[PDB]
């Protein structure tokens, strides 16, 4: 070989560190993106009696809206879990320290 096995092992180790680093940052971007989406999709409350009970009914109906949308995307994720499980099954089808003491 044209470089030492110790070098290729050093490079492989450093490659994994920075890939892990890119994974971590990607998770931090996702956190910040989630907060921005929630500030848009769930603007915090800003508070008369009649206007209050109109709002509460609008919020009550919105709860029903969101939970139906959230179910609809959960159904797609669920079939993807079963599909992944089907594709994964298709791919499947395709000691020394006691010696040194006893010798020395």
């Amino acid at each position: 070989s044209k470089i030492s096995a110790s070098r290729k092992l050093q490079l492989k180790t450093l490659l994994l560190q920075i890939a892990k680093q890119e994974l971590e940052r990607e998770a931090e971007e996702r956190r910040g993106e989630k907060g921005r989406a929630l500030s848009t999709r769930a603007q915090p409350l800003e508070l008369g009696f009649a206007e209050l009970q109109d709002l509460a009914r609008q919020l009550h109906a919105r709860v029903d809206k969101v939970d139906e949308e959230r179910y609809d995307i959960e159904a797609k994720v669920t079939k993807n879990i079963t599909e992944i499980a089907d594709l994964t099954q298709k791919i499947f089808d395709l000691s020394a320290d006691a010696m040194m003491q006893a010798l020395l």
Binding site: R57, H60, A61, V63, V77, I81, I91
Partner: protein, 67 residues
């Protein structure tokens, strides 16, 4: 004049229309927190959906290349 639609609107009248000033502003807080919680779950499910599409794509490459 749909019976299932009429009943679907009676659920918020039954839930809200009988509270006084202050249970109303305390019920509205909990409704919003529920909406916020559901949207947070919905965002996470959307992120998971994208990652599955990539994972399925990789799986399809592997099956084709190992056949």
């Amino acid at each position: 004049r749909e019976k299932k639609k009429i009943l679907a609107e009676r659920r918020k009248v039954l839930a809200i229309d009988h509270l006084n000033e202050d249970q109303l502003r305390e019920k509205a807080k909990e409704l919003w927190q529920s909406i916020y919680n559901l949207e947070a779950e919905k965002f996470d499910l959307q992120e998971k959906f994208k990652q599955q599409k990539y994972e399925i794509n990789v799986l399809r490459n592997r099956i084709n290349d190992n056949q």
